[PDB]
Amino acid sequence: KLQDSLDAGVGNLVDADLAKESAKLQSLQTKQQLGVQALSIANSSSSAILSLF
Amino acid sequence: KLQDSLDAGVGNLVDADLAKESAKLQSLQTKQQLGVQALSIANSSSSAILSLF
């Protein structure tokens, strides 16, 4: 019983809660796509000046 | 982040504002044409005297 409680305690110390990581994963994938889109918007600022010339 | 801020600072020091240069360019081209016309008017002053002779 002592060996089982030491192993369960190691699990309390280091194990991930995977049900919570699933939510973090989905939101982070959406954030990465929005960040690529925002960088694409920032890249195009120079093209606006071409119209004046 | 420090490298990006040093590069943005160099850009603040030396970069042109091209939207402002477009206005300066158009007005200067008009001024150059008017200056050629004014020099053409000044060139013709001698011809007025031919009428008296």
CB-CB contact of A37 with B3 (8 Å):
no
Name the resolution in angstroms.
2.2
Structure method: cryo-EM
Mutate to test the interface with B, among A39, A46, A53 (most CBs of B within 10 A): A53
Chain A contacts in chain B segment 1-53 (CB below 8 A): 18-19, 22, 25
- For chain B, give the number of residues: 53
Best CA proximity match to B26, nearest among A49, A51, A48, A52: A52
CB-CB contact of B19 with A52 (8 Å):
yes
* Chain A residues whose beta carbon lies within 8 Å of the beta carbon of residue B19: 49, 52
| CA angle in degrees (0–180, nearest 5) for B24-B28-B34 | 155
CB-CB contact of B19 with A49 (8 Å):
yes
